[PDB]
């Protein structure tokens, strides 16, 4: 017997996918424990190997065989045989199928059947997931019947002559079609043999199969004897059974109105005389005028005028001041009033809403096309003003509709200042605009920015200014490392800022001489490992640089004067120097006292009551509480293990382990607002079934001052209203609207600003602006703030009109990722923070700095309590271990014997992955011969090839990849193995990768703990945001 394995057939079949199902699954031998076998047939069947990888039916033999090297299992629904035959166009799991059969469809109705060791199985319509592995079998059957209708090289020429119109077309190339025929040989040879029996085509095909021999087998006779247990991978596993029903979200009448209106309107449903007297004179001695006539209509400071434009739509300018030119000219100054449609909002903005901008313009009075009605909205803020705002909104909308019906001029309103450079909508400086004093604040800002572009040397000849930063003699500066003169291995060759001491300014328009400081990583990687992050080595290397190669200023002190407080995400540009590094010998020595280097010399209750929606294990809440800005008094979490973990880590919190929509409905029912609720009847029934004690502790408007959390947006095409109605972002925005918190921090994945052609982001911004918020957005990479796991997160800050929008934390660690840009419109882009790829104050955190001291554990552990065996060595271990003396959650997911063998066979070299496993039939101590190489990708499809990272180890000096949120030791494992040990990353190691302190505790199964760790904002990034918010909170 001759068989062809996956190497040749892999071209036609798609990329290998894996089988998943629900908990409904029963054994097969127990149903029928015991040629003349039961003929039970199958619905929604599927086939797989021992790794639950979908496998073509072509890999099973035709006759009896004593030993079948390839093991194959199946699943489906066992049902009564009805003699269903195919011509064109309770759940069970099978045992090791021993063969398969084509039944001769004399009336062109050929069927499909399989034989396990117990009973026959006729095959019906398969599962939709297995259809890609099902269609090629039908295609080759159609080819076989086409040749049968026709009746070796003559046949190949005949079938190559056919074009793509016929269903039995393969390819016009003789060689490719011959390869296709020889690859699917037995599937045609047996079909021809069951009809001609000794036709030359048959013997030619057999000869070709021998020419492409890949596996021999022995044909035998009746050997049925039940001597197997089940050996099925599916047997014994408990599948995930949640698939929570996406019920319609509970929303307020405002958010629902906005989203429904958007998805229903779109988606697949002259005399120029003055007026008055001058109130003063400008600096240039020009008259200052407040009011003027234009073509019979009015123009005044604080109003808006229109400028004639070439087509398109006229531009609107907010008048700042009016003056008469020296040559008796009527001229005015205005600020650009961007229309809502041209901002990042796009089509999700009202027609009547305009946004102030920093761009200014100056023009003659006679160039005005006309004056448009324009008012500034200053509605009061607070939860108690929501009903009045709703009534005013309805009245204004009715008035606008009435005016549009009678084709009257549109009345505009402005309530936000759109700054794309800062990337957000801010509050209007009502006391700084429309001053009519002849001074434009935006013009002053532009002039100041222009002044921040010149390399000017001060009169003292001992310093200069660059980028608005003053440099002086004896200061400490940053120099780009270049200016001096694998997936895991991202930060493998990136150097931090070169710290230098600027000694003398030598003119050349001048160059600066700087003495060099040497970082620990310059000596060796091991020295950088066992040393502080903020340590510098003194040296006597002086280099001359242009003044444009200086990035900032820092401080350098001794060990005695270093600050006592040590926050983990370091926001202080402070280093300490104690040792001397000699480049000639590379030897570190003590600092001699002969020179005595001139080092740097020293010379409330704002905590906000917090409601944390979708809290999870509490990473964001812990980070914000460590920064002294959040209380985490209330939390809401659907998942039971996540709520348990939150209650474990935050005992003082009040955790609601319930649906967000149900909790919102209960809150809005307690407050007395039922007519403002858009909720399903199921939500009403669930909310009505709540303990009175729980309803007594529910939050109410006025008791919440900070709402934070990340909604689980499904995203992923322009979905209709009936599909976007069930998203949790609507419930989150309804929470924000009803409670009216002073601050609102939304967190989501990087692709949040691109879901549904970016409509979700625009709609979120539109809802937040309709509420009356100041909204800013950005994308932050957690890897640049201390963690060793790259994670890009989109953050949206929202603040009350009278509050201050927090700034974005400055990245302080090197990370090789370009600027993270959000595209607004008109080719404009916004970057939240600078890309610390070519330079940063501190070196990147490596894997060894994170998991280099934890005790070793074998593959699969359950001991949740252990003791440390090695003292903390690096800076990260010392900082994250703290005073903890009991190691918790140091357990790893247990892999089967085959996966353990595969992991042990992976070499402990950087960049190693599944490409390094040897090709050999392995045999674990179970009687199950298996292929060692996990995947068999097609030779073609280069883009769909190069599957690097799967079964991949971690580089010691690399960083944790993004693909370790939920390690899965069944199919596509990914880059999750340990750098040195033969195991998957433990829960504690994954927590340390995200910056979770060793004192943090997780709850639930290992899968639940990993899901909590992967779904939480890193406590480092959360703490950085918290301290930025604390800085913003002290201004007000
Ligand atoms: Zn201006």
Residue numbers in the entry: 346 to 379, 386 to 440, 454 to 515, 526 to 569, 574 to 647, 708 to 748, 751 to 925, 935 to 957, ...
Publication excerpt:
In plants, DNA methylation occurs in CG, CHG, and CHH contexts (where H = A, T, or C), with the maintenance of CG methylation mediated by the DNA methyltransferase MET1. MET1 possesses replication foci target sequence (RFTS) 1–2, acidic-linker, bromo adjacent homology (BAH) 1–2 and methyltransferase (MTase) domains, whereas DNMT1 possesses PCNA-binding, RFTS, CXXC, autoinhibitory linker, BAH1-2 and MTase domains. Of note, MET1 has two RFTS domains and lacks the CXXC domain. Arabidopsis thaliana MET1 exhibits a plant-specific structural feature in the autoinhibition state, and a conserved activation state compared to mammalian DNMT1.
